[PDB]
C-alpha cells in the first residue's frame, strides 16, 4: 500500500480508504472497480527488491502508524516503532507463504523445518485433483471417495480454491499411549 | 477450476519452469583469492540481449 | 499442480542454497524438496 500523509488529520495516514474498499465490495457484489482501477487510482505500488533497498514499510496499518498518547497476556509481542517515516504498507504478511505452504493451519507456532516438511508432503496429498476426471485419460489419478474441507480455514484457501476442492479428510485424534503400537 | 498456464506438446502437459540467472549490464566486483595476481576484479557480462 | 507451476530452477558448502533476506515476501521461505536439490529450487 501507499501511506503518504496526503490528508490533514495530523500525523501520517493511508491513501487507501474504506470507501475505495466499499466500491470494491460493490465489485464483490457483481459476482467496474478493478485492481487496474486501483493502480490507476494510485494506491498500490509495484515494488521489487531494488526498490526495497531504500524504503521503510509498516506491517499493520491499524497498529504502526499512530503514536501512543491494556494488553492481552495470552497474545504475541509486537515490538515498537523506532521511526515515523513509513512509506509503504504490507497487505497482509500471510501472503508470503507459497502455494503448498499456506495450506498450513497455524504456522505461527511450528519449528520451521516442520513447515518445510509440510511443503514437501502436501504436494503428495491425494483426493480431488481436478474436476474433469471422468473425461480425461491421464495416468495415476487418486480420487478420494469422500473429500472434506478442513476444519482450519486460512483465508488463502478461499482464493486458492482449496475450500472448494480439497483432497483429504478429518478424523478424531487423541494423544495417549494405548497399547504400545 | 483449471486455470491453465501450461502447454500441450503431443498430448503431454509439459510445464516450463521459470529459470533463474544473473545478468551483466550491472556493476560487478569481486574479491579474488590467493591463487591469482588479482586482488579485486570488476566484471560485466557484455551480453547483447 | 499450482505449486508445480510457480516453481523455480537454478543451475550451478556455499551461500546460494541459503534463504537470503532479499527473498522476503517473494520466495516461499519454507518450501524446497530434500536431497541434493535442497536449498536451490524455490517457489514464489
Amino acid at each position: 500500500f501507499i501511506v503518504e500523509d496526503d490528508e490533514s488529520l495530523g500525523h501520517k495516514e493511508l491513501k487507501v480508504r474504506k470507501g475505495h474498499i466499499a466500491k470494491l465490495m460493490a465489485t464483490e457484489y457483481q459476482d467496474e472497480y478493478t485492481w487496474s482501477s486501483l493502480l490507476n487510482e494510485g494506491l498500490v505500488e509495484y515494488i521489487d527488491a531494488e526498490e526495497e533497498e531504500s524504503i521503510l514499510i509498516a506491517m499493520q496499518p491499524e497498529d504502526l502508524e499512530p503514536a501512543e498518547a491494556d494488553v492481552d497476556p495470552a497474545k504475541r509481542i509486537r515490538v515498537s516503532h523506532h521511526a515515523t517515516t513509513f512509506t509503504h504498507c504490507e497487505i497482509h504478511p500471510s501472503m508470503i507463504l507459497g502455494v503448498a505452504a499456506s495450506i498450513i493451519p497455524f504456522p505461527d507456532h511450528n519449528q520451521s523445518p516442520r513447515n518445510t516438511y509440510q511443503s514437501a508432503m502436501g504436494k503428495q496429498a491425494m483426493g480431488v485433483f481436478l474436476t474433469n476426471y471422468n473425461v480425461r485419460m491421464d495416468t495415476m489419478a487418486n480420487i478420494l471417495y469422500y473429500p472434506q474441507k478442513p476444519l482450519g480455514t486460512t483465508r488463502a484457501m478461499e482464493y486458492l480454491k482449496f475450500r472448494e476442492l480439497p483432497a483429504g479428510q478429518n478424523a478424531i485424534v487423541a494423544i495417549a499411549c494405548y497399547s504400545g503400537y | 477450476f483449471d486455470m491453465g498456464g501450461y502447454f500441450i506438446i503431443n498430448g503431454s502437459e509439459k510445464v516450463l519452469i521459470a529459470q533463474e540467472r544473473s545478468a551483466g549490464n550491472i556493476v560487478q566486483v569481486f574479491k579474488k583469492a590467493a591463487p591469482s595476481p588479482i586482488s579485486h576484479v570488476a566484471e560485466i557480462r557484455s551480453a547483447l540481449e | 499442480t499450482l505449486s508445480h507451476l510457480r516453481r523455480t530452477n537454478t543451475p550451478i558448502l556455499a551461500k546460494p542454497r541459503q534463504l537470503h533476506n532479499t527473498h522476503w515476501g517473494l520466495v516461499c521461505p519454507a518450501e524446497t524438496p530434500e536431497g541434493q536439490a535442497c536449498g536451490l529450487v524455490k517457489n514464489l
Binding site: 480508504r17 474504506k18 470494491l24 | - | 507451476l5
Partner: peptide
C-alpha cells in the same frame, strides 16, 4: 465516512479483487 483508516480485513477484499481479476498463472499468461 468513505475516508476511514482501514483494518486488515479490507486487505482480504483487496486480495479478493486482485486474484479474481487475474488468476494464478499470471506470469505464464504475461
Amino acid at each position: 465516512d468513505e475516508s476511514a483508516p482501514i483494518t486488515a480485513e479490507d486487505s482480504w477484499a483487496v486480495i479478493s479483487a486482485f486474484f479474481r481479476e487475474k488468476g494464478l498463472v499470471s506470469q505464464q499468461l504475461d
